[model samples]
Target: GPLGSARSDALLWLAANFPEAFDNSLRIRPLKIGIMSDILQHAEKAEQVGVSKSKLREAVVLFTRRLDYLACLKAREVRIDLHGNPVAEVTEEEAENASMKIKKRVE
Candidate 1:
């Protein structure tokens, strides 16, 4: 394994456990709303392995708040579930919100 920090460890764990919803790649798909709760509910059988709830939250923020991640939130784009299956479509409002967030950070 490569050198890792808590954030990276959390991301790797998420990617390994929920590849469909969470990714460790540069270009990640838009996740369905309430993914944190979704993963917890889904991963209850596994007991989250070793990642803590707070660590997962931090990892999720780091994962979803990236410009690249937000950029993928196009109107009509498919939002994925833990299985990587499409569960919802991105609304125009959601796309716009993502764009605004991008602009806010870049400016």
Candidate 2:
């Protein structure tokens, strides 16, 4: 098997798939390389299985779909996580009661 080609494949994959992650920077981080390194390892495993090159090509499509699905899910999660707390009505009595409970605990 060719050595390190998978690692290179990962770089290309990220460059094309997630261009934003590679935005111009004078500095490079191990974390960044590690991310792609992990992906390439995964791709390498998928490609190394006893399959025809054609099938490997198809696997790339499947890989892309998997990532795309996860991206959508992650975006959804971010929207929910960063949406902030919901606005709710509370009576003045309720607010005072909660404040008093906090003061009691602190005391």
Candidate 3:
């Protein structure tokens, strides 16, 4: 619940600010750190240029584990193309198979 809706919005703002740079953020390290600082400054100026005041504040929260988080977001999309959507990763079937094996061993 900590990095929920607000955090999502923050990433959206960052992407909106820089599409290519942020999209490939996983390939680099300093982007998460340096680019965010760049973003804060840009956001400050953006507000002056008629962007929202409170939205910037809400969209500029802590980004400590953001590199790992953003990497995970792109993990499923690393290989194949989703045709304009994030890959849908599923594990429930794996869970079901394990449960069936356990039931047989119990017998």
Structure candidate 1, residue pairs in collision: none
Model 3 whole-model lDDT (C-alpha atoms): 0.43
Among all windows of 10 consecutive residues in model 2, the one with the lowest summed lDDT is 74-83
**Model 1 misplaced stretches (Cα beyond 4 Å):** 5-7, 24-27, 42-49
Better of 2 and 3 by TM-score: 3
Candidate 2: segments with Cα more than 4 A from true spot: 1-49, 67-107
Ranked by lDDT, top first: 1, 3, 2
For all predicted structures, in order, the TM-scores are: 0.84, 0.20, 0.32
Put down candidate 1 lDDT per residue, 9-30, tens digits, no spaces.
Answer: 6677788777766754645787
In order, candidate lDDTs are 0.79, 0.35, 0.43
Specify the highest-TM-score model's number.
Answer: 1
RMSD for each of the candidates: 2.3, 17.0, 13.3
- For residue 45, what is the lDDT in candidate 3? 57
Candidate 3 worst ten-residue window by lDDT: 75-84
